[PDB]
Amino acid sequence: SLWWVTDAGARFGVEDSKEARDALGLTLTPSLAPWVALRLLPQGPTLSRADALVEHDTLPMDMTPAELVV
Amino acid sequence: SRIEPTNRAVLLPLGLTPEQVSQARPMSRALFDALPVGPELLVPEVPNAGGPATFPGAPGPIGTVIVTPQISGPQQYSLVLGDGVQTLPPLVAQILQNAGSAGNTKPLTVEPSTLAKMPVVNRLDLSAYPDNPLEVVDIREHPSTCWWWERTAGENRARVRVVSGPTIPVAATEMNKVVSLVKADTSGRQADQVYFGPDHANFVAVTGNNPGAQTSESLWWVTDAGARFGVEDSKEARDALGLTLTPSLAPWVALRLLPQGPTLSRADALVEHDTLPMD
Amino acid sequence: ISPPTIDPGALPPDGPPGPLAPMKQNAYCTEVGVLPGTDFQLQPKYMEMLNLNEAWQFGRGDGVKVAVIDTGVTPHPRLPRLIPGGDYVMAGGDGLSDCDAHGTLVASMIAAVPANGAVPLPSVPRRPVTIPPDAFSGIAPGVEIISIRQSSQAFGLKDPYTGDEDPQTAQKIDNVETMARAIVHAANMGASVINISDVMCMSARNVIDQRALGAAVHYAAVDKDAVIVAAAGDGSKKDCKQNPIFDPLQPDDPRAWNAVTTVVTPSWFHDYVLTVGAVDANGQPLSKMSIAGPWVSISAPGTDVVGLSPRDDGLINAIDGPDNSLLVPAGTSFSAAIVSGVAALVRAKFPELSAYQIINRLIHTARPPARGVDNQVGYGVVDPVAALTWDVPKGPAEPPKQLS
């Protein structure tokens, strides 16, 4: 399985297929990592072309957020 | 105004036909709420009909139609009530004869000398009916109709009119850039298309629907994509976004049709998220 | 605080009105007057928002009985359709005299008849006060008003000892009990709109037992189909203090029931009672004067009040204050009067609908606030002409299945 990790600490799954790779870039070969560690990062939706093709008027609100303190 | 297909007495003088009325096309819920309601098109209900008159020399029982001879000048119709007579417009006299016929087909003709003795009275309202036949538009050639509200800066009154045409009142060149919305609300209270013409307004204040409304109840922001977002009316929220300016007026009947997004306020934005959901 | 619950077995038994213990009058009745420079030939400023000239086309609300549970009403030649219902403050009364100037103002704002060259009832048999050409018109001149005298500031107990309960709290329990009885009695009179313009504020800490009041509200709202409308509560009263609003860090409950500190009753029963907040004559909420609880549901005007004068035969603008000062009335106690008139007009045009449906017709046609639903004002500002003509869905509000 292939994963993309953001600087903010979130992980997203990436499709193995030529379409998904060619569109994002990611042609180079990935590095290895152990599942006992990688599973500790929070998970977002997978980047699949088939689900990006959507329209919305308004988005759903996020329950249980956290405070930004200045 | 409401009208019934069974009331042949009123359909005929106006110039309508029972089949024509029954085959009329639909009307959207959106437009149904926008138009103000007027009194119904029905036969006038003359009070205490048939009894004898109070005044002397009355030409007939209360509710009969009187007319004067053409040789003395243009004919004036009138109605005899209990305490006197009140004038009638030409189009209404025809309805009273047709409806109040009961077999009778014509009025009583009386001379000016005998008419002049009768006292003048005014006891029933009749301003609803037009004074001439209706120029009904053939819907096949004009399938579009719209309600229009406008107010000029510095005026105390808004102008309300109705528009009819072959297509939506937008310029022929711009017909390509009408925005087609998604439609989550199935209650029939949300529009299908939105258009931002010349001199459009972004920042708006809600006002009453009647032409004489003067209130200014809440502030909203309308985006190019068609959604509307609310703004909390506080000095810190107004200045942070850069909305220290005077807002333009808008009526609730028209504005309620755009989809509503989250509220803009300083307290709502001071939050952190790991990742967003997707219901 | 958990939302109210109801046990219909607690209904109070029916009976003629009478206090729980003997009482005597302790203060003189309040004097009234007019502010300098007023001109009663102009309409009150609050009547522009209602657009009455267009709303009256469909009728003036003939044949509707409205119950005014308050400090009673004093007869006047402009109220030809007043009925004496009862008294809970003095055993010998019938609710047809108000010592506090509050009662006749609320009633006259609903049903006073417009001016004419001669009055229908020129006779003036009204009794004296007890000791120890014109533009004004009501919202629905055709209604019939029932008066019931529920509360007053001028009276007190004539054996003041109260035992093991603090004399301050001992009076609250008597009020909660005496309020339930008046609602049950007014329903048996056949009223179709019950208006309540006096309410209690209580600390959230050890709220008083309201079981008797809960069943009484349910009986009148469901089995007798009455519309109950109550004021959000004026903030100048003895114990009312301001409540917190929505909190963005906890989307758990959008009305914020978990942060309540002051409870207003009977306004508390948001499932069967319609609560009205206040706004000024321009449309801004009276942020400093009305309690912003989570139960609030609608709002209406509340300034520039005008009404028929008790103890006189003309109009008034102010009441005689504690000092020599002439003090002007304002607040939710009057806004609830405006909505009581609109409710009467609506359920004259749609006589087939039940109470739960008439309420939805008023809520859905109101102009909403920036947050969609708020606490200082409920769904928005009331709108008469819209309530009488738009095509409202018969079902309650529902969220969409999917937005994408």
| Residue A9 forms contact with C (CB below 8 Å) | no
| Residue C39 forms contact with A (CB below 8 Å) | no
* 3-class secondary-structure state, position C147: strand
Q: What distance in Å separates the CA atoms of residue C173 and residue C184, rounded to the nearest whole number? A: 18
How many other CB atoms sit within 10 Å of the CB of residue A40?
9
Q: Give me the count of residues in chain B.
A: 279
Residues of C in contact with B216 (CB under 8 A): 282-283
Long-range contacts of C58-62 (CB under 8 A, 24+ apart): C58/C345, C58/C349, C58/C388, C59/C142, C59/C345, C59/C348, C59/C349, C60/C140, C60/C141, C60/C142, C60/C345, C61/C140, C61/C141, C61/C142, C61/C143, C61/C341, C61/C344, C61/C345, C61/C348, C62/C142, C62/C143, C62/C348
- CB-based contact B268 C391, cutoff 8 Å: no
Q: Which residue of C has its CA nearest to A51?
A: C404
Which 88-127 residues of chain B touch chain C by CB within 8 A?
A: none
Residues of B in contact with C400 (CB under 8 A): 184-186
- Residue in A10, A58, A62 nearest the CB of B261: A58
| Residue C382 forms contact with B (CB below 8 Å) | no
| Residue A51 forms contact with C (CB below 8 Å) | no
CA distance A27 to chain C (A): 31
| Residue C118 forms contact with A (CB below 8 Å) | no
| Residue C372 forms contact with B (CB below 8 Å) | yes
Report how far Cα B97 is from the mean position of its chain's Cα atoms: 29
CA distance A16 to chain C (A): 26
- Residue in A42, A58, A70 nearest the CB of B274: A42
Residues of A in contact with B271 (CB under 8 A): 65-68
Beta bridge partner(s), residue C231: C276
Please state how this structure was obtained: cryo-EM
| Residue A55 forms contact with C (CB below 8 Å) | yes
Q: Which residue of C has its CA nearest to B269?
A: C248
Beta bridge partner(s), residue A43: A11
| Residue A25 forms contact with B (CB below 8 Å) | no
Beta bridge partner(s), residue C277: C299
- Backbone breaks in chain C after residues (C–N over 2.5 Å): 132
| Residue A68 forms contact with B (CB below 8 Å) | yes
- CB-based contact C283 B212, cutoff 8 Å: no
* 3-class secondary-structure state, position C54: helix
Task: Please give the interface size between A and C, counted as residue pairs whose CB atoms are below 8 Å apart.
Answer: 16
How many other CB atoms sit within 10 Å of the CB of residue B277?
12
Reference C155, options C178, C180, C183, C132; nearest CA is C132
- CB-based contact B227 A57, cutoff 8 Å: yes
Neighbours of chain C (3+ CB pairs under 8 A): A, B
| Residue B180 forms contact with C (CB below 8 Å) | no
For an interface test with C, give the residue of B252, B256, B260, B271 to mutate (most C CBs within 10 A): B252
DSSP per-residue letters across chain B: ----TT-HHHHHHHT--HHHHHTPPP--HHHHHHSPP---------TTTTSPPSSTT-SSSTT-EEE--GGGSS---EEE-SS-EEE--HHHHHHHHHHS-TT--SPEE--HHHHTTSPB---S--TTS-SS------TTT--EEEEEEE--TT-S--EEEEEEESS-SS-TTGGGG-EE------SS-S-SEE---TT--SEEEEE-SSTT------EEEE-TTS-EEEB---HHHHHHHT--SPPEEEEHHHHTTSPB---B-HHHHSEE-SS----
CA distance C344 to chain B (A): 20
Peptide bond into C266 cis (omega under 30): yes
Catalogue the active-site residues of C.
70, 102, 333
- Backbone breaks in chain A after residues (C–N over 2.5 Å): none
Residues of C in contact with A54 (CB under 8 A): 404
Reference B65, options B54, B56, B76; nearest CA is B76
Q: Taking the CA atoms of B135, B139, B140 and B142 in sequence, report the sign of the dihedral they define.
A: positive
- CB-based contact C403 A56, cutoff 8 Å: yes
Q: What distance in Å separates the CA atoms of residue B249 and residue B3, rounded to the nearest whole number? A: 35
- CB-based contact B213 C51, cutoff 8 Å: yes
- Residue in B259, B271, B276 nearest the CB of A66: B271
Cβ-based neighbours of C40, under 8 Å, separated by 6 or more? C134, C135, C136, C306, C315
- CB-based contact A54 C252, cutoff 8 Å: no
CA distance B209 to chain C (A): 9
Q: What distance in Å separates the CA atoms of residue C19 and residue B157, rounded to the nearest whole number? A: 55
